[PDB]
Design a protein around this nucleic acid. Sequence first.
DNA 1: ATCGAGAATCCCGGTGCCGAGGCCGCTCAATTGGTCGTAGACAGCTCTAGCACCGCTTAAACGCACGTACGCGCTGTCCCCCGCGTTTTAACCGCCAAGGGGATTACTCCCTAGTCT
DNA 2: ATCGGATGTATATATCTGACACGTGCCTGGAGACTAGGGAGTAATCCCCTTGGCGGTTAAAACGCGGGGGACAGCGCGTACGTGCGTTTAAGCGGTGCTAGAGCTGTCTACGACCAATTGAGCGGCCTCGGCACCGGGATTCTCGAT
DNA 3: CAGGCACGTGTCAGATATATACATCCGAT
Lengths: 97, 98, 93, 93, 82, 82, 323, 107, 110
Amino acid sequence: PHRYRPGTVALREIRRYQKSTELLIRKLPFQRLVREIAQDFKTDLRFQSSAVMALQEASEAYLVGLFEDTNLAAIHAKRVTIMPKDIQLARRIRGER
Amino acid sequence: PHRYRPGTVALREIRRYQKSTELLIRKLPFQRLVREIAQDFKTDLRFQSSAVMALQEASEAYLVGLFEDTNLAAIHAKRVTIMPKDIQLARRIRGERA
Amino acid sequence: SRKESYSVYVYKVLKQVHPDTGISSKAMGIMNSFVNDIFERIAGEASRLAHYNKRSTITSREIQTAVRLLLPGELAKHAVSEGTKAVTKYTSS
Amino acid sequence: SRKESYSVYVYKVLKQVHPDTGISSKAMGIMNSFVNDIFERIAGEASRLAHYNKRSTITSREIQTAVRLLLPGELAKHAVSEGTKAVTKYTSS
Amino acid sequence: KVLRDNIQGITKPAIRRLARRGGVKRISGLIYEETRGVLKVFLENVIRDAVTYTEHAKRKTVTAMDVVYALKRQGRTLYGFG
Amino acid sequence: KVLRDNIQGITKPAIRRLARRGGVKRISGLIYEETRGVLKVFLENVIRDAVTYTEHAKRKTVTAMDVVYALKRQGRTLYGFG
Amino acid sequence: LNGGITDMLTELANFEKNVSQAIHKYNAYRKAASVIAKYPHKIKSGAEAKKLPGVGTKIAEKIDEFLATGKLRKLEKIRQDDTSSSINFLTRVSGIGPSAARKFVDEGIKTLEDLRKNEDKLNHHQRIGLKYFGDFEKRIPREEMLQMQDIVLNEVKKVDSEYIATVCGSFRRGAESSGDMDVLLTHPSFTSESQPKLLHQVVEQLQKVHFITDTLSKGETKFMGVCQLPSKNDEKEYPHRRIDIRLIPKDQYYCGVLYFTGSDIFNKNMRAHALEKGFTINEYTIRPLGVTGVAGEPLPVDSEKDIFDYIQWKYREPKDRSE
Amino acid sequence: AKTRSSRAGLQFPVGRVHRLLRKGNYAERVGAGAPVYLAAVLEYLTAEILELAGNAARDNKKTRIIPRHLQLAIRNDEELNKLLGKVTIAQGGVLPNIQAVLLPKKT
Amino acid sequence: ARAKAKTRSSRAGLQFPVGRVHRLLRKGNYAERVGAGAPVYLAAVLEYLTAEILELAGNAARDNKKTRIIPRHLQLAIRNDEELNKLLGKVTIAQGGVLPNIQAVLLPKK
DNA sequence: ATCGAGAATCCCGGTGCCGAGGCCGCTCAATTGGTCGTAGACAGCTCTAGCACCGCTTAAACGCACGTACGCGCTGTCCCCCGCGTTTTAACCGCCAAGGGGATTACTCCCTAGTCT
DNA sequence: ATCGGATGTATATATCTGACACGTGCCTGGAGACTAGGGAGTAATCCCCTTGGCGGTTAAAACGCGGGGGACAGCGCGTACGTGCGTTTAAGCGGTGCTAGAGCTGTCTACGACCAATTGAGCGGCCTCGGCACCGGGATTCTCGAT
DNA sequence: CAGGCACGTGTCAGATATATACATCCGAT
């Protein structure tokens, strides 16, 4: 059986998910999550579809930027595996904590 | 020959400069540097003393924050000595240079 | 040239909460700058809201929503409670 | 009602620069949002400058200073040059 | 039916795809909970401001305009919608 | 006269004291040069805005109000000066 | 001896009232005009007139300029202003005030001719004021007031003998003329703690005998209207006169009579005397004053002499109530 | 009462806040209740800052507020640190904070 | 009278409307009075910025072998330029994507 | 240290599609032409403070010596994440109802402005 | 255990802040009913966009498992950075003198707000055909196990 | 418009802060 070496099937689809511009998160789970988060503030709230789409876009861009900074910190740490402490460091440096 | 271990005379200075509020930068060299920078945008400019003091306050606070972030990056990198690449990483993540 | 400052009001508040202490001039200027910054922020947010909802005026709701937007949870709740109490007291008299 | 937008103006600018290109609806919306954002930033900076300088009106000088103070470097220089040329052409009638 | 435990809707492959677009090579195992937590915090922060926006105007539907306003308030300035 | 070089006026002990206030123990040798560069570029960024504010007011004296406005423009609000 | 000084100051506050809409001047200028009008000396300098504290430079400068030049350029400019003069002339109509005259001049209505030509733009009160513009501005001799007072009292006792009506004001004080009639009525069954048709019966009875010719406003407490004495079938008809009817409870009627009898200076002096004697006197009742200023339960009032005795002051006839 | 502030029971000026709202070109019409509400909010925030500073100032056997005490009060609190996270204070200094790794050996 | 009209944008030789800019400046409540030269100057600045960003977007679109500009081309043009990226550093573009960027360390050493 | 098998991707061609762009019918906001109150441009005045210089005074900066400990290279252990295959599953698309909510009039109702003596 | 930096304790400057003194622009200056209209609060509708449900397909998610390459702990070292000391040199304080320009005020004067009257531009509706999405196969290229 | 008055600014006595001396008390060596 032909098996690719570990790492190649990562950089492949790194090229794919950086060349493409779809969502990469399913619509319905994110919609349900948004509704669950919203109902804690005011019960029985309605959401426009465009509002959920904008929330998804902004959140996904924020997550992409956070992962970029996490990868940068991991590379600085003499390492290629990103860890939660890298996310903590990036968030603390960015000023979110 | 009373010599302290390297590192103790670091914390004895850390607590002092964290417990105090002095500017830690000599005023006249900073004023000369500010005038040298300012003459590149408009010749024959004169500065109020309070403006120079505010500039010194802002630069001192910014450098202190940058050094704090550099220290955090250095400790994250499993190290206690800060290096210029730590400052590079801190500025990069902060969003300043790019 | 008569300057505009919040000095006497800050001093009155300090006497109302800590009668036995005083405040330096530099701290007075810092408090004045802080008050000016908060006032500018709240007024700007209220103006943004009034322009946003097509309204042509600023009422107590605009300032209240600005307070709720800027200040964090406990501070926002206490500020809204205090301001609502003040508005009710002013209206009732 | 009626929703005003910069669609026709952006289309004219695109035709004036690239005669053989099109543009999608979402790209047009992004361009419109960018135009509104930049206009809002420049107008706010000009208003802030007028308030700082105790003036009551905003003129070409205020907008020029705001443009020089917002846009970075050569972009600001070229914007100032183009705006000055346009103002001279307009005042020439 | 009040919603419950929908943070698990952000599946591990979705976080993996987001990280791949971010530009990481290999991903640890304990990172998914942290990513879900920070995602929940950010979403709560944005939606609280959006809900406060949509209540000052006496309305019950969260418009994308309110989301844009809330995002611009936090320093995001999302283009596109509106 | 004309100021030739003054970035060397920010001496090594000054950078060391600032770093100690930051909370470090050991400092490398290139930290001083890197910090001088960063301080120079930050001062240039602030001074450009301050000089623009001064020029708009048709004044030849850069007051503290111009400096605090320039600092507030970049989000680094300064208290105690105006 | 300031006949010209007083007259020139008269209209200045009026423009402040009907055009500038500033009562905070009008009142000060009328106080100054009254204090000048009673001063028994011809004014030579404004600084001398400043001896009335409250002559801040603003009156002193005007009087000095008037003495030096015989006029005021501000006054001359405001006299020849078409808009200001039109507004002032329109405000002479009853019911036409600052806002009404300003709006009429804004739409071009500036003279009595336009006011007559624009009936549809007027309410009932303004139309009645327009109809009797000349009649309302005329003064009323005392013999006519005696005739119509006799008629009013006859009709009031015709309605019910238990009614009590008193014509207060300058006519009660014995003045030879008045600008309007203030008639005060009470009823024993009507007290502060007690009929909404008591005034209606009197109004209907006076309208039946054709004494009241018009109604401006009529409520359960006070009535505004017009009256005119009948001519003896051969003489010229008497001009229409403004008559006021106010219904007061019995426990407040004599206090109201004292308040509306006047004069204003006399009323102010009586209030000051009550205050220094530890009492407060108003239009409606008199109350004792506590050591801390808290007013108590109002005292029973059954006569004006009772009110005078409350403040330890000798009863004064209305003829002696000039000040 | 006579002054508008006394009617609302505040020490901050209703009139000055209203005048600033008018001149500041925030909206061409300002309601009557907005300046009172804003004055109450500003008064509460000032009282919070001052009481936290006093609880900090007092603790070093010092009975006079110093910019260092204001910085300590703002940094120590959590909500106020979030409110003023991007604000620097002249002569404010830094919180005493040494990382545990930076601390020396147990020995 | 009433000579034949010619929009102030055409007077200034601008594609963007200076009249709409003037109306927005007046009704946005930015200042008590608005000068006559400010709307022209602002419209010229906006037109220059739009022309530059559209030129880079069209170049990117033709590079990607397309005739029609899409948000991906706008994101590529914004991020590729140095000054424009600095101008819009804190702006997220809907359906924009991410510039291809892989760290040199992650590449296979072999 | 390339051949070759195996897999992933670009290219060319064919087909259909839905929205980008153009045209028509407008409504209303931009434009012209006037008046009129005033924001500030331009001169004149102070007189405050920023700049230049000099003379001590000494605390910080610096060059150099010397120890030592920490970053970095290296090596060996092991463990856990990735590539691939197999088995659910709920995401998504298609249709339906439906129902309350944003956008309208519409009567009136306490609130606010005018007035007046 | 000794000894240089942290602690208290008492004292002597010293100094910047709070209780008076005087001026100066803000700040608010009668009331009691009787007309007359207004934003809006609720009653009453009108689409209609979002909510909810049900069923059919299947791309995607969950689960198992064999590695193999990367995370990580331990060792050795050698050189870069710490602390200390004598010396210099430039910051800092205190006068001394000077004038450039910040701040203020008076005078108009062009300039922008504001209002009729007019009309051409941009928005809404309604086609329509072509750039592009999608699918299929061939050609080209990238990757890993051995010869 | 005329009063009433809360701030603005200036001044000096003096609580409060700072610096200066000695006796204990605790991390390197």
